[PDB]
């Protein structure tokens, strides 16, 4: 399971080139070798986010959150997942929805990044 790490990193590197189906496939190899690890699933959510499939992205976030809780993952990661859902809504200019999910994120593990992003969502909401 230095194997799973290697699959994950090939996945990440591909994702970063916008080589999305390749990333997905390696994330899948990763999950197979190591299915208690939510990380692969949230990364997949990143992929769909960038492909611009916001619905599928939220679904994988939700799945990643389930997996993480079930397997007692870092709260931080659960928070990232929630914040990613928030981001998908932000992309869609559904700011009440974005903010709600940032709040969920913040309730799991408060991070400045998410706070700031939430507050800019608040501003957009407020100023029209």
């Amino acid at each position: 399971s230095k194997q799973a790490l290697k699959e994950k990193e090939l996945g990440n590197d591909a994702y970063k080139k916008k080589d999305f189906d390749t990333a997905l496939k390696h994330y899948d190899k990763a999950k197979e070798l190591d299915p208690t690890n939510m990380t692969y699933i949230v990364n997949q959510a990143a992929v769909y986010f960038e492909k611009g499939d916001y619905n599928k992205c939220r679904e994988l976030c939700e799945k990643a959150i389930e997996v993480g809780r079930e397997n007692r993952e870092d709260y931080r990661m659960i928070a990232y997942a929630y914040a990613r859902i928030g981001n998908s809504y932000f992309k869609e200019e559904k700011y009440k929805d974005a903010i709600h999910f940032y709040n969920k994120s913040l309730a799991e593990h408060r991070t400045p990044k998410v706070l700031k992003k939430c507050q800019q969502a608040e501003k957009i909401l407020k100023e029209q």
């Binding site: 996945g11 970063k16 990364n43 990143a46 990661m77």
Partner: peptide, 5 residues
């Protein structure tokens, strides 16, 4: 892009 971990 969204961060991957």
């Amino acid at each position: 892009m969204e961060e991957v971990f």
